[PDB]
Design a protein around this ligand. Sequence first.
Ligand SMILES: Nc1ncnc2c1ncn2[C@@H]1O[C@H](COP(=O)(O)OP(=O)(O)OP(=O)(O)O)[C@H]1CO
Ligand SMILES: Nc1ncnc2c1ncn2[C@@H]1O[C@H](COP(=O)(O)OP(=O)(O)OP(=O)(O)O)[C@H]1CO
Ligand SMILES: [Mg+2]
Ligand SMILES: [Mg+2]
Ligand SMILES: [Mg+2]
Ligand SMILES: [Mg+2]
Lengths: 191, 191
Amino acid sequence: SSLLDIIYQLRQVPRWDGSFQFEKEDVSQHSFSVIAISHILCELKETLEGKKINKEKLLLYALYHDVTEVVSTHIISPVKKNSILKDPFNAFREQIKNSLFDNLPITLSDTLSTILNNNDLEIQEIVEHADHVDAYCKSCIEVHRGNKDFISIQRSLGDKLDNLTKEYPYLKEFQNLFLKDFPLENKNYRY
Amino acid sequence: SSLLDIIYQLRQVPRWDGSFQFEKEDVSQHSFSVIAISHILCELKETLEGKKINKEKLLLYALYHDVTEVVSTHIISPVKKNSILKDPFNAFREQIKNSLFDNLPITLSDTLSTILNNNDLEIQEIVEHADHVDAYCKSCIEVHRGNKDFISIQRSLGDKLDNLTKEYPYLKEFQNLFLKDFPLENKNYRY
Ligand SMILES: Nc1ncnc2c1ncn2[C@@H]1O[C@H](COP(=O)(O)OP(=O)(O)OP(=O)(O)O)[C@H]1CO
Ligand SMILES: Nc1ncnc2c1ncn2[C@@H]1O[C@H](COP(=O)(O)OP(=O)(O)OP(=O)(O)O)[C@H]1CO
Ligand SMILES: [Mg+2]
Ligand SMILES: [Mg+2]
Ligand SMILES: [Mg+2]
Ligand SMILES: [Mg+2]
């Protein structure tokens, strides 16, 4: 199986092509953050909307949500969501899923097929939101480092996030708990 | 809460201090790999030992398993496991857990307390094994890059892993599926 190789190969997939970064980010760092944010959003959504989400399925979907970028590389959103490339890329992404599981055990084959051909719409929603939050957090850190080139990126991501908070209350709560003072200038927890 | 800041601050905690690396590794990259390896080991253990593990608790424990290193930094194993520092570091690690959850919601407070003061011995075993596997994988990649300084590291980690495979059959199966050809020189899955 290529599965373990792929997990480490995600470190070789850079994000934010075409933008200057004080700290270069790869897909593995991004996916770690998306898993943790997905967990936090899920806890808030459960308490606010009176439900229980299957956290196993959620975390595993977050874990592998960008795994197809080992083949496609990471295409930034202004290119991926262009009306010319929008549907073609989604078709490309779908061909990648149908080609990765090889020489695996059946429980591994099935679990990975379940994850990669997921049809749980709410888990897909939570991870999509966690993905936007993480992008916003990255832009916050770069601006904090002094990167003027991310100011406009922070503004459009922030504008989109503000719109989402009006329609998804668990996102507004996340914003209130974490995103109004981020990153922390004084990391008092170290001492 | 410092929780979201801490998740991104783990990128500033380097591993393998005192060894030359062709690719510098941080705790967030390492934890992403440990989560995925924990999942794979858990699937194999379930099939081989006839059980079902709580994957929510497992994945969340893997996710935060080194979170206290935002305070302690990453102390390499030959120093941490020295008979002088062994018990003191464990006591230090325990003081760190009792100081991190602040201004959180109760469901977040409790979930994080559950995770950080875990007493599920088998989940702790799986993640400890995934942690050794990941260290072995890193040494394999460095040696593959041509790093002669990791040859001796690869050998002691490999020797320890071989011993573990004699006592934990799910580890031997993982070794047979993934660790006998790692990393892949020819990444055919990209094409
Ligand atoms: N303003 C921007 N300028 C340049 N690149 C951007 C910008 N915003 C995002 N990116 C890059 O695209 C990556 C992901 O961003 P995001 O998640 O917000 O966009 P999508 O959800 O539409 O794309 P996705 O489905 O692939 O996640 C991000 C870093 O490379
Ligand atoms: N031979 C080595 N030489 C130098 N550093 C090493 C070596 N082996 C491991 N390290 C570094 O220690 C980190 C973790 O290694 P490992 O997980 O195998 O050791 P422990 O399980 O005993 O330590 P832990 O409880 O903190 O995980 C690793 C990279 O920094
Ligand atoms: Mg996105
Ligand atoms: Mg993503
Ligand atoms: Mg270890
Ligand atoms: Mg670890």
